[PDB]
Amino acid sequence: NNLGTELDYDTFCFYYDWYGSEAIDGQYRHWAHAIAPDPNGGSGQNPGTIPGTQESIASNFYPQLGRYSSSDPNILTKHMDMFVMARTGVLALTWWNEQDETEAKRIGLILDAADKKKIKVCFHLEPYPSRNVQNLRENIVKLITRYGNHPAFYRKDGKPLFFIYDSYLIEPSEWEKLLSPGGSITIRNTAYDALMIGLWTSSPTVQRPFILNAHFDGFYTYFAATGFTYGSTPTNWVSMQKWAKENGKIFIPSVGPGYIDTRIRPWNGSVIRTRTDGQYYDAMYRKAIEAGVSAISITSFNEWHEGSQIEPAVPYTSSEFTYLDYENREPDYYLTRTAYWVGKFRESK
């Protein structure tokens, strides 16, 4: 078929499976959330918590699907149908190494639901406690062993792919052990080789040697808020792509529709980026495509705490909070607008 509706398998959408519902789980997990203390504020902050009631959830927006469980197979079905609407072929799943049966169940449910719609899944390896290159290798081995034969397990030219959040927390000298072909615990040329995509944060003076010396296969930028880092400043993307191409690296810039996290981080208002009826998303996605990249990542499907979600949101005013909503756009606008941009990306590829 040549309909202009097919999934794109170089488009990665960051997905969070940490929500919990009455129907499935037993606490309204993540809809209830601690309010972060101000890192520059007084001593003796008791910032409190958002209780995750119908009226008061840990987001500035309100989901169309309500306080859903990420363990609810009927929610997962709906989510995969939303990925199909958006034309996003890869779900980049947050992964926290919880070592619990409920996590294992959820991952399996997600892979199964994804496959019914021909969506692929890769892992977004988060900064779990004492993360280091040895336990990262062990966990890569476990994920490939457990899930590598699942038909929804993502591969690019035969290789799995991982995004590594806050990769700068591990020194390049440690990364080299895992990621250089000569490294003492290398995955290169093994059954567990993978494309490893590190997080480009700050200036080229710092990031270029970091990426080279760490032996990452590529880099992404994550943040939906323009200007939050050098990497999330889209005017830098042409130059970042040129460097990537020169150095055999894969650049996967991250685009998002807006940012606001002030329910959980009330002190962080300077990072707010207004959606402007889709104009912010349009501008960011255009810059990614114009940079001439081979792959794009979307922040986010459903990071509701950070207000970067493309998942449908609805107007809601409760006794406790007046939520933001999609304004003059319909709840599914960011899904259909994603599909528009995926088409533009494909036209350029």
Ligand X SMILES: OC[C@H]1CNC[C@@H](O[C@H]2O[C@H](CO)[C@@H](O)[C@H](O)[C@@H]2O)[C@@H]1O
Ligand Y SMILES: OC[C@H]1O[C@H](O[C@H]2[C@@H](O)[C@H](O)[C@@H](CO)O[C@@H]2O)[C@@H](O)[C@@H](O)[C@@H]1O
Member of 8, 72, 217, 306 binding ligand X (CB under 6 A): 306
Site for ligand Y in 196-255 (CB under 6 A): 201, 223, 229
- Closer residue to ligand X, CB minimum distance, 215 or 263: 263
> CB 200 → ligand Y: shortest distance, Å?
11
* Cβ neighbours for 20, distance < 8 A, ≥ 6 positions apart: 26, 27, 28, 29, 30, 31, 69, 70, 71
Q: Tell me, what DSSP letter sits at residue 140?
A: H
Angle, helix 172-179 to helix 133-147, in steps of 10 degrees: 40
Question: Which residue is closest to ligand Y by CB?
Answer: 271
Strands 254-255 and 8-15: what pairing? unpaired
- Which tokens belong to 345? 């990306």
- Which tokens belong to 136? 């990262």
Site for ligand X in 122-141 (CB under 6 A): 124, 126
> CB 328 → ligand X: shortest distance, Å?
27
Member of 84, 91, 121, 271 binding ligand Y (CB under 6 A): 271
Span of 19-27, 107-115, 146-154, 303-311 interacting with ligand X by CB under 6 A: 303-311
Q: Which stretch of DSSP H or E encloses residue 286?
A: helix 279-290
Site for ligand Y in 281-320 (CB under 6 A): 306
Q: How many residues contact ligand Y, by CB under 6 A? A: 7
Contact call for residue 17 and ligand X (CB under 6 A)? no
Contact call for residue 268 and ligand Y (CB under 6 A)? yes
> CB 115 → ligand Y: shortest distance, Å?
31
Site for ligand X in 80-119 (CB under 6 A): 94
Contact call for residue 167 and ligand Y (CB under 6 A)? no
Member of 15, 162, 165, 192 binding ligand X (CB under 6 A): 165
Which own/partner contact pairs does 71-79 have at CB distance under 8 Å and 24+ positions apart?
71/20, 71/21, 71/24, 71/25, 71/102, 71/105, 71/106, 71/109, 72/21, 72/23, 72/24, 73/109, 73/113, 75/21, 76/109, 76/110, 76/113, 77/113, 77/116, 79/15, 79/113, 79/301, 79/302, 79/311
Contact call for residue 305 and ligand X (CB under 6 A)? yes
Q: How many residues contact ligand X, by CB under 6 A? A: 8
Fill in the amino acid letter for 286.
Answer: R
Site for ligand Y in 173-192 (CB under 6 A): none
- Closer residue to ligand Y, CB minimum distance, 271 or 339: 271
Fill in the amino acid letter for 22.
Answer: E
Instruction: From 348, 340, 349, select the one nearest 5 (Cα to Cα).
Output: 340
Contact call for residue 192 and ligand X (CB under 6 A)? no
Distance CA 13, CA 193 (A): 22
Site for ligand X in 229-258 (CB under 6 A): none
Pair 61, 323: CB distance under 8 Å? yes
Torsion from C-alpha of 99, 196, 180, 128, nearest 10 degrees: -30
Span of 66-74, 234-242, 272-280, 298-306 interacting with ligand X by CB under 6 A: 298-306
> CB 230 → ligand Y: shortest distance, Å?
9
Strands 32-34 and 49-51: what pairing? antiparallel
Q: Contact residues for ligand X (CB under 6 A)?
A: 94, 124, 126, 165, 264, 303, 305-306
Q: Contact residues for ligand Y (CB under 6 A)?
A: 166, 201, 223, 229, 268, 271, 306
